[model samples]
Target: PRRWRRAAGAAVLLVEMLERAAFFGVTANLVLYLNSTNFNWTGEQATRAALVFLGASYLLAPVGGWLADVYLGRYRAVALSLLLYLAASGLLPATAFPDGRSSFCGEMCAPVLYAGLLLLGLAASSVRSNLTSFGADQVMDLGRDATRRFFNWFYWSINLGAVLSLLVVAFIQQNISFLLGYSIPVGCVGLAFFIFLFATPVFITKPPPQEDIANFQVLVKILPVMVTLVPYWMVYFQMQSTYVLQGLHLHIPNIFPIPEAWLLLANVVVVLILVPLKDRLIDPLLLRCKLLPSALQKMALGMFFGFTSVIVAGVLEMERLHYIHHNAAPLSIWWQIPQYLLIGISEIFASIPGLEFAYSEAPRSMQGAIMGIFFCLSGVGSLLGSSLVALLSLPGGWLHCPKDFGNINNCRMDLYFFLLAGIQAVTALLFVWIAGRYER
Candidate 1:
């Protein structure tokens, strides 16, 4: 704690917290904004655009990280990225707020929005791949335990920011003007850039290593572990889209109704509550018992939980289907709590630990590249989801759901969940098999 205070660790956490707040503030509500009459984008187009933005964001991380590793160095890369972020943020809201009677769906609007998204995607990739590595650089001399704890706290801070965005920014986006909704994140990220600068006096930085140094051997060893994680991400991201759709169709009394979008908050809320417990209690107890799990072990456990969550979702969907078939009241949104909670717990065990593993397993010179690959896994997972959706919607497919089917009642969403669960189970086993073969 003392080291964290004196070092630049807190600074990194604060920057990330604010950055996440800014990022999520936009992303969490973006689909709704795009689907609104202002943009008038069809559901398919909006979803596709959002996924493209996300995929680009993660895929670009390697380029950003490589730039930092080979040329700019971490601090410079981060600073430059924040400047790009500021420019993108400013550009984004401006495009939305032209003359206050905006024509955001006009001919030129799509190009401008796509440009802003691409810029933001680049900014995000640049910061994400390097920021954690930069934070760890601040405390590299600290023992492994301290570093491990920092990653936990790092994840906690991320969720904290996500919660704030979901609660506050989402509300603004829903209730307030679109301009104000986006403008707020611009301010937040600008503040983060300045705060990051304020802490620069204390940060530790290193010169770039020789260009010829290779990390291909280390990459080979971790490839399977990273590949196995894709299925977990596919399951995890369903909360963003499928779960929200499910919530929208459920029958709830008007007096106590919850918005479908609000259902997305459940994971962040659970994350906020679980992080401290895992960091302060569960981890320590495991350490004392001489049974602390390895990074891979934790990740495998997380995959197991992810599979269980999908199974729970499948079962719940089945029940809801039965009710619809019988003309009964659909299941309430509250029924989704268990699945969301389970997914949150999976993140604690899998996602955070995976970040730690990526950093720890890599040689110093290649940490940035390795971290970039770590993020790219999630991007690939998202791409897999996109492809899977296309494949399943084809004729004679098991998870078929017609494009025109607004109500999930006519779709086999339950079958989709079951398939996801089965894939996750297989992936978890594959991960465990590969994990046993991994070494320092």
Candidate 2:
């Protein structure tokens, strides 16, 4: 007899690894790689470009989800999207040359590079919403022990991919060609997708396409909540762009040996070690004590944590100015450790709880669509962040600043961060208020 649980569990774990590997590979190196003068881009410019790429992907997620739910069905959508993912990942390395330093990639391949970005974005959105939802479809309803074990393995597999990418990709970018280094992981995603495709016929599941039309009431309930998530994404997605840039510029004491990108590693490591214990020990204790905050409460708390993360950035900004004024060697990157750690903690609290909450809040039939819409808000938020950065430091508002390693006086980042901190704070408060009135 075929062991459906074992097979499904293994397949889900594998797909999760592949998705995370591709994502972290790009995210870990994108900022530093782009900001380098070798790329012919400034820090601000590079961040904006990355933001647009991330934003557009999420923006299309709902459409991708809708197509999967109605026309393509989950299986077909995943198949097509993985192919797209492989294609884009394979092509990315072609965008840059070897270990040579030139301010530009010679402007020869910029268009091709952008095309790759767009392809990758669409593929990611389609695959992300489809894959996990499909994974859940494998079990009609998993009990507490099994569900806990499955998601634990799921989260770990993702981090395993991320940790591997962080170490491998970061090392390669440091040594070999960043583009070539990126190519290796791209190849991995391509291979992973191919392997996943092979298992399609044998894998067990909710067998796609019921051919049912969605209810009007489902749309009415979901759309408004989906729309509400935009501000959260807008305020929440700054950990990478604005926050990381601030980290690079600040003075950090050289206590820890980990690379700045590897700060994400800290998060993964924490999850790996602590999550099981939390599930086994604290979860039961909290239940016994009735002290466990509800998922929504955790989500609200996570937003508050996001607010504080920005405040951490603001304080670091002030410190950067202090260091710059003294004309001292910039602080060790370790100073950024706390902020990233807090962000990692926030993700554990906010993202996981919020995901559970969303699933419970939405009707059963429309689950995939609702999740896809959630991702779209995330995409919009990234775009909004990119747009705001472009507005503040790009051609329109203040052109006086040099965005590179130029004059501190010309760069308005200190003011920019202060403004972002306020935005996050206000947004967090609003989230709290909105959450209070929410019955679900």
lDDT of 1 by residue, 1-440 (tens): 23444547777888888887787666654455456535545345543455556676888778767877778877788888888888876666554555422555443455556666777777788797788887666555675777777788888887777667667775787786776777788888888888888877667667773333345566677787787787777767654567666666666556653354555566566887888887889877878898757776778888788778778888888888777787736485677777777878888888788987887676777678888878888887787776766666575353344344435434667666777777778888888888888853
Clashing pairs in 2: 40-103, 251-331, 252-331, 252-332, 252-335, 401-410
* Residue 401 in candidate 2, Cα distance off native in Å: 7.9
Off by over 4 Å in 1: 1-7, 24-52, 90-114, 173-183, 209-214, 245-249, 253-258, 317-327, 330-335, 390-410
C-alpha TM-score for every candidate = 0.83, 0.72
lDDT of 2 by residue, 306-411 (tens): 7787788778778767876777455556667677767655665666666566666555565678778877777888787666656756664432243654355456
- Which 10-residue window of candidate 1 scores lowest in summed lDDT? 99-108
Model 2: runs farther than 4 Å from truth?
Answer: 1-7, 20-51, 84-120, 144-156, 166-191, 194-203, 207-214, 252-282, 315-336, 362-364, 395-407, 410-418
Residue 60 of model 1, lDDT score? 79
lDDT for each candidate structure: 0.72, 0.64
Assess the local accuracy of residue 136 in candidate 2 as a C-alpha lDDT between 0 and 100. Answer: 55
Q: Each model's RMSD to truth, in Å?
A: 4.3, 6.3
